[PDB]
Design a protein around this nucleic acid. Structure first.
Lengths: 79, 23
RNA sequence: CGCGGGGUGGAGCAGCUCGGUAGCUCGCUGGGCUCAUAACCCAGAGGUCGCAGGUUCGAAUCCUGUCCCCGCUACCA
RNA sequence: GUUACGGCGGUCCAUAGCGGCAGGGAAACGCCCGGUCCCAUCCCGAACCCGGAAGCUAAGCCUGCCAGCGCCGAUGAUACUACCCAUCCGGGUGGAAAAGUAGGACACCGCCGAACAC
RNA sequence: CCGGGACCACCCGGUAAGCCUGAAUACUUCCCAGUGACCGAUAGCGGAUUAGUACCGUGAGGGAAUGGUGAAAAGUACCCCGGGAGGGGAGUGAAAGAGUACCUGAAACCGUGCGCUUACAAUCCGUCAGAGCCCUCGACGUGUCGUGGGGUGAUGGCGUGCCUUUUGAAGAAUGAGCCUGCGAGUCAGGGACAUGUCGCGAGGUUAACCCGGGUGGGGUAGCCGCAGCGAAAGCGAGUCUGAAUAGGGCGUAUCCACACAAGAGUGUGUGGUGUAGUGGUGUGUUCUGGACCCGAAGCGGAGUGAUCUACCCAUGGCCAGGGUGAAG
RNA sequence: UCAAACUCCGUGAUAGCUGGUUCUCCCCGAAAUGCAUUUAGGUGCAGCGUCGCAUGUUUCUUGCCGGAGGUAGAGCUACUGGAUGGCCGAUGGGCCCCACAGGGUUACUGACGUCAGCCAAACUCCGAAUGCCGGUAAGUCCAAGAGUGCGGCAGUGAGACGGCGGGGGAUAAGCUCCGUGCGUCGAGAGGGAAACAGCCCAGAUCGCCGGCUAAGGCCCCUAAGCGUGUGCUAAGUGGAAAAGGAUGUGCAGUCGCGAAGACAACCAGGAGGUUGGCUUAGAAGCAGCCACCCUUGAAAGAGUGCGUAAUAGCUCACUGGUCAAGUGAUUGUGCGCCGAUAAUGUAGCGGGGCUCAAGCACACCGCCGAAGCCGCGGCAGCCAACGUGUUGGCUGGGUAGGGGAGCGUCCUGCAUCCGGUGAAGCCGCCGAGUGAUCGAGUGGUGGAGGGUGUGGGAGUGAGAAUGCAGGCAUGAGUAGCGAUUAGGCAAGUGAGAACCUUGCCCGCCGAAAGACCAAGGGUUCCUGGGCCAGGCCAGUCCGCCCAGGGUGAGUCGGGACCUAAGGCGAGGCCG
RNA sequence: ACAAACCAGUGAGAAGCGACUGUUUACUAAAAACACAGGUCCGUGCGAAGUCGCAAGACGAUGUAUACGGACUGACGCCUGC
RNA sequence: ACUAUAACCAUCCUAAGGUAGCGAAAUUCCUUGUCGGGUAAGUUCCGACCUGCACGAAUGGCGUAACGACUUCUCAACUGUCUCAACCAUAGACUCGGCGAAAUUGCACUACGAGUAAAGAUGCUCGUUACGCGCGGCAGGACGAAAAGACCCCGGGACCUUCA
RNA sequence: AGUUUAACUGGGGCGGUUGCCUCCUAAAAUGUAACGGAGGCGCCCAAAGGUUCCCUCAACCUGGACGGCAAUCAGGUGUUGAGUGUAAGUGCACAAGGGAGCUUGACUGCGAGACGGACAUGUCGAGCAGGGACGAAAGUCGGGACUAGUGAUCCGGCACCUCUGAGUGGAAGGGGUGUCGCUCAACGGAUAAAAGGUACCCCGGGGAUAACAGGCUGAUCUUCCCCAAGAGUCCAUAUCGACGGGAUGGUUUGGCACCUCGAUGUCGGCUCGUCGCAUCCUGGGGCUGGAGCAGGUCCCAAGGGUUGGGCUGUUCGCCCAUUAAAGCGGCACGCGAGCUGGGUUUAGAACGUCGUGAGACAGUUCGGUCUCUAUCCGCCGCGCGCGUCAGAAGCUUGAGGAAACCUGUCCCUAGUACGAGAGGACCGGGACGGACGAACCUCUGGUAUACCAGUUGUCCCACCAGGGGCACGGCUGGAUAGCCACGUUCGGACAGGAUAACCGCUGAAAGCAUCUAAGCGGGAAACCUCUUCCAAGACCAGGCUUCUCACCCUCUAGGAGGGAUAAGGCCCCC
């Protein structure tokens, strides 16, 4: 006999790249995702592939806003 | 069969502690 | 070891999805020619390739289990 | 500063909702009156927009009443579980610890403004 | 007319279709004289020897092995055993433990003799303990003791060869009968990379070649460094992209201090410090080469083979005896 | 020798394949994964090792903190799906009013909805633990010999079993494929497991006739206990096994009854109605079935059964008595029984043997037990300290593999030394070194070149290649000693006779095993002599060895005569 | 016991294959395979065709279509269809 | 018109649809087809049927006298092929003398059982058995010797074929 | 003529697959394999892109002309179940879903920083400028809600460029920028260019990988078993025992691929056996729907026995006759250094079929080399040595082993019991037998290599005669011994003990009952004894007896060594 299956796609390495508290530079990829399981918030932008990137430095802060899970970047105050 | 059975039940010993190579 | 393969009016055969499936011959029905078949005329009549699913709006049509007589099935040591 | 108040926001956006049954119209929010003007309907001055102030809080909005429906929901226990012990007991230790249930939880906070107060 | 890298023009160079021409250059069958951090008889030529011999093969062709007495044969007269061989005496000799089997004379292997052990025992053959026996060295005292050493080993415990290759082998997977010899990362190159070391040093170095009976002295042609960026033209501590003073790429050896900008990750200017390569050589990898060694089946070139065998050609020979009984 | 001969050459053909690759020690030490591959038993790169350089704790562990997840589990009236039973009841099917519509009604189906209980890797209103990312404080910190970057050198890229989570598979495989800061083997000895890579303990620097321990064990084999206490087990369970069967036994209960006499036994009674009805020819306390009553009364069952053709008779359940207290039914557990069942020989404790436990459970006490730890001593590596080499700490299993340092051999430059008053080599003795190995220590043999130091260079180390050559073993004093005729006696010779010689017999061939030629061989012929090789034994013999001799042709066979096939082939043609 | 020993056919029936005698895998196959005579087809008009050869040249053949070569079939009989 | 088949018909396709003859065949899987013969009994054999998996006319078909070291079957005779083996001789084997190999070989004072183990043990475990050494014999094991498995696979060759 | 003709593959082939995307597997980061489970892609859109603005569905209810469940209309409920170009997932109702307007950012130059990461690939990207679109403006726009929709490099083409231009000016050609051309789909893409066979095969390798066997597993298979719906006149269990369930065994087909591919020879037969019992017969027994004969079923029992033939290579099977019975299995489907070699499984040839073909066929057919001196273990036998506390001898015991162990027919019991009859016994006695084995050779029979006779041919002994040699002892006919079977005789036992299944007795625990727990018995071809044989190497090396039961020498007389002897034995000899 034979199987009509056997295929699979390449793993896309989606996920969260910078978790809560992680200090990140601007443009840093925080979240690789397909939709908006994580939404963009403060100083975070959404790319064409629904990827979340920091628009400014800071520490990643995961929050909520009207039920949506959000990703925010809180500034790191210099001494 | 008897041979495999005995060899597996050998693992139920105070020394082997319920594990042996090839069980 | 295992694989494979078309179905449609009563019979035999066609027809691949612009949104219907149907058409041919034979058969059958009614009439006519004949003193009574064949050959002629038709109002001629006649089927859901079985169900499930489409991206379906809708599938004979496309895809899968089934629909199943199918040519080839062949482990060579 | 006080309002049965008008906006702008916030919350691990439901303890906030829905549905009650009884209420309010000070300014305001509103329905509401008309389409002459900007503007508008793939038709409609319904809407959008504009001009207005006839009457009405009926509704929206707002206030009080609530466990009726939904939402929240511990504790403790259980399941599951990393490590460990244990010669099958998936047994047991010390840690973590749900879901469901049950007990119980019914909006709050800020800024401005309005009328009044002052 | 030809060439100047299609081609055309200009310019330049040259003057084909005719010939000759030494030296510098390549090589060594052979001859002479020499050298070797070359071999030294399983090596070195295949061949130190009967060597392209013997031998193999029809043939082409393949292709061995075999060195040493001693300083001098003085090579053992003579006697004895013996058919002889071989030996013992005697002699030669420095030595016959140098006797044409001969320098030294290992091992495997074969014996002989002495000691210990072994014929009730299940043995990867040994190891550890160890009785008893024997030998030995010392001591004391006279044979028991020791800081002992050796050989044997009763007996007890433990104990599954080596290599290769494997997940894993004592392995009933491979290879090896044993000993002795031989038998596998080497060599060349201004090679490549890295590293060490030495020399010189913003320079380093020569190659070919010349002179030197040498390993030494000359030899600047080149090579690598010394400025990069760019496709390139080109520009140059800048350059490329680009419309950009607008950012980025590469580069400006590195570091220090200051100043100014920034805190998008730090940058920009100034000053200073000032950049380290190159050639020898060793080592490790690597490139081209057979490239650590052995190993195919097979491919190609040129030849040898039909004296075996297949077929054919020419010329000869052979087929007892007995039957059957065609045509004519 | 032929699916394309042989020989030489190309050629040292090439082989992703197999094999082999030679001395030592010190330190470190893998992998068997990913991606790609005319790739899958190869290779490149990455990962993992080593070395060096740079950096320096960044690594790692623990605590705390910030975080994202959707697994386990759970839940589904929270979605998609599945799905059990009810309830309602659309819907249809029928019926009746009977048309056609509209009606009621249902033996039925019965959606939707609802009540309750459920399920799911590709379902999730939920949701862990862990793990992961980050931060932070500490720990280790004379060390993990960490981590990162660069570069030199790699090897690996066939993994295995086991624990856990999982797929495939029959939720079989000593199966296969994955995951697992999981382990071990690999590459890891030692102890236990009878033996037994992967299980347990524990990671081997060396030595010791010292000690403590781990796992596991303490009757004898076999070191330590026929240990102590309380119970259990009767099956040698222990020292294999299922569904399931089962008055095994102990414990813990629970319930019914019980001296107002229980259960058991012994004595006496133990129904009428009535056949309660159907059914069979019948039905009755009893083929079979519907109901499953009342009545005298203690007790009487719609009868407890037998016997029964139905009945009877039989005893029953039940009632009363005689003696006389436990009796009966069940629940869970701790040990057990059966089920139990292969084939060389006990053979499913490792063995003896064990219940007078040497078995099981729970406690307790000691001991044995390793290359673990400690102790004493030695060595090495890394590091530190202090001093210009000692001490101390830590470490020291190791395959591929990397790095470092060395032994030995030969040839050599230089400098030295030894040696015919005996070098090397070989054999030994006595010894030495951490190792390869050493011996300017000794003797023997031997006879001429060697040693040492410092450098230079290597045909530099073999145990393996079904390696090459030589020599020698094992088999083994074994097979065989070569036909199908057959040898024997006497005498001789001679050192020696089965074999030679002579004679006599016997036997074999006799289209041959006789005689003659050719081809081929080449002196093998003859005479004399010899006997260490050869002859498959021996040998006085020989086709062997040595010497000498021997082959005479007009007519034989050939040339000088002839031509065949065929060959060479002047010139020539062709190339 | 008279073919005396030695020497010296076994025979019969039937089927398959191949007609036959022969040939063959030296060294595991002797056969139903090959060949065979016979048949058909095709080619060849002649230093033919075909073949060896670069060519010359040679065989074919000192032959000339009743011959030569190649292919298939394989005595003979009946046949050889689309 | 019983049934069975189908002389016959319809339809589709084809270049044409296999004629004669043969047929479980040297061809027939099913299959030891079925029937008959032979046999006491016959998967073989003979004859016949035709449901020809998958005959077929010069890759000739169907037959065929004669022929065959062909293959198959049957029968007579014959026999040690057998029931069922016995005896005799000879050559070896055996013994003595003489000469004197070989393949093989990691070793060796090379037991058996049940186990264990790279899953089949002389070599390990627990036991059992066994005085040491030979001679003739047998061949169960030493996964015995021999030949770097030919089957299979991988890799590479060679030769062969062809519309590569 | 040179070459190609892929790989993965639970051996290979065939089949299938090869890249990309989505989910699950996947173990809550990422990632994660399998010929694991499901699907999709190799596009589409000039709007289905951008922007601004607006809207919110599906479903359900109700009312409505055609109009129906469902077209379009109205109202209501409805927070999302619709729809999102297209697979799935993640998302999207704040809308990324629906609609309209304007448009082309489906831009140029660039890109801080990141993701992912063997490498090559791939991905996001704020922000600066240019010049634009939309928007009042903020702002958004470098294609699409996202993730697939694709192809490295080489080579070459096209357009543009203030690059280069082989002496110079040009040109060619090259270069840059943009872009095009590969189902190179085996999708990291050997070549621009490529299919097959080998049984004629070869080489290198592999137990990395199949066939045999072994091993594991035990789906399957086999042998049992649990429940018992039931069939059985009734009655579940005399017997069969469904649906279902649990196991044994390891013999079947298989799965795995663990030893072995520098060789583990294969089926079947022959020979030789050996083991187990899941027993075919014989033996013992329980139950019976067992009257008796005969059975059925179950239990115990492995001592012995378990035929010869036809067909087939066959195992198996069918058949023929028989039998007491014609067992099932293991031991490398026992056994090829023991045999065969018919088959399978080389090379030849042929048929059919497949293939253009070479060739192929778990299709057929005819034919077709079976090597080896036994070293070790083992086994069968036989010796040598030593020991068994002096040497010797005779006779022995029997631990412990080996062998053997089979069975029928007939008769009487008795035509009795039983039974309507048919038919027909148990138990117990007797005879005769088959098969097997041992011993023996009187018989019979075979053989007879120095017997006798006859006889053929030939040669010889001079010849006749008589004889001999040779021809298989020449052939024939006979044949004592020995060897032997076809022959003779004998054997297996009887009896006892202890037991299995089973039958019980006495009897409790448990006032009864109970084959048992204490006790006692019976009980089978199995076991031990008995019969035969070997046997004290029976290392506990035995026992009863008998014989010799005695000298010297040397070492320094310690413990030995040597010699000569006895009893006796050995060798030589017959």
């Amino acid at each position: 006999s034979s199987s009509r299956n056997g295929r699979d796609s390449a793993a896309q390495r989606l996920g969260v790249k910078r978790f809560g508290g992680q200090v990140v530079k601007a443009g840093e990829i925080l979240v690789r995702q397909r939709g908006t399981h994580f939404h963009p918030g403060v100083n975070v932008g959404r790319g064409g592939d629904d990827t979340l990137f920091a628009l400014a430095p800071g520490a990643v802060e995961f929050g909520a806003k009207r039920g949506r899970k959000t990703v925010n970047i809180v500034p790191v105050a210099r001494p | 069969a008897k041979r495999g059975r005995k060899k597996r039940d050998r693992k139920h010993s105070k020394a082997n502690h319920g594990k042996r190579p090839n069980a």
